[PDB]
Amino acid sequence: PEPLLREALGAALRSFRADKGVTLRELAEASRVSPGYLSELERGRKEVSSELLASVCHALGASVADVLIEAAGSMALQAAQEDLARVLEWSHPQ
Amino acid sequence: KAPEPLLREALGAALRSFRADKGVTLRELAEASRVSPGYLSELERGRKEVSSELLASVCHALGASVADVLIEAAGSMALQAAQEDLARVLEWSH
């Protein structure tokens, strides 16, 4: 289906972190959560509290709004790509 | 208190805007999404963190992608942050 919110936000957070060149353990330290927890968050396997999303975004020098737009853009793209892949597999299989 | 609203605050306001635009009552939406009207109300007022799965069914019950509700949530957060920063400078001088 449409990607879940936590999957989209996790990937967006990961992109922002990679953009800034900040390691996961550094970002988890700035946000006061374990590196494992943040790793799971990035992988779409954990639901963030709004408070923790705010700390992680702030630590990255990003507004939460910017991370939401990133997440929404990639959600739509991912749905469209998976749609395109089904349409083509049906009409042009290998 | 940060000027940027918490994600659950902005998401709840966005859901309420989608619901109101469609003219759907909380009991109707609860029924479609199999959650109590009581929980939906707290969600709308920014007092509940929602799982991604439940967010998806609510949005879909309203005929909207999660990604559209998130874009609306992001625009709303950014606007309120800007308005609250403006209020703060004005309170300081003027």
Side-chain angles (χ1 to χ4, degrees), chain A residues 1-6 8-19 21-81 83-85 87-88 90-93, chain B residues 1-33 35-93:
Chain A
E2 178 175 33
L4 298 176
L5 179 54
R6 57 174 185 262
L9 289 167
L13 284 175
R14 161 84 215 236
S15 297
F16 275 71
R17 178 170 66 66
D19 187 32
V22 164
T23 68
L24 179 61
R25 183 180 180 182
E26 295 178 287
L27 181 60
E29 185 195 30
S31 310
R32 323 302 180 199
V33 295
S34 66
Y37 184 93
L38 192 52
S39 169
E40 284 291 284
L41 165 65
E42 290 186 351
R43 292 168 133 296
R45 301 179 123 269
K46 292 278 190 208
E47 293 294 348
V48 244
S49 72
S50 300
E51 291 80 357
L52 176 61
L53 183 55
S55 305
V56 178
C57 295
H58 180 255
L60 283 184
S63 68
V64 175
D66 292 344
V67 176
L68 305 184
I69 291 295
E70 180 76 7
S74 77
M75 289 174 51
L77 174 60
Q78 152 109 117
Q81 288 186 135
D83 198 29
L84 183 278
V87 168
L88 294 195
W90 191 84
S91 59
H92 282 108
Chain B
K1 188 181 180 202
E4 193 154 47
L6 295 173
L7 174 61
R8 59 172 187 273
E9 297 171 326
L11 266 172
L15 284 160
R16 184 194 312 120
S17 295
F18 276 79
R19 178 180 70 80
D21 185 51
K22 284 36 131 60
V24 164
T25 65
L26 280 173
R27 296 201 168 153
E28 290 164 325
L29 183 53
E31 217 62 7
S33 49
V35 52
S36 72
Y39 172 97
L40 285 177
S41 179
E42 290 294 285
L43 174 49
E44 286 186 348
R45 285 145 76 262
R47 301 186 103 211
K48 282 294 194 331
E49 293 291 339
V50 59
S51 69
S52 301
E53 286 91 352
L54 177 60
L55 183 48
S57 72
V58 172
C59 290
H60 303 159
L62 290 169
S65 64
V66 177
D68 292 330
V69 175
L70 264 194
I71 289 163
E72 168 73 12
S76 175
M77 304 207 339
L79 178 57
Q80 165 72 23
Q83 288 182 330
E84 171 67 24
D85 286 335
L86 176 61
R88 295 175 184 195
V89 187
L90 288 175
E91 277 161 9
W92 188 248
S93 65

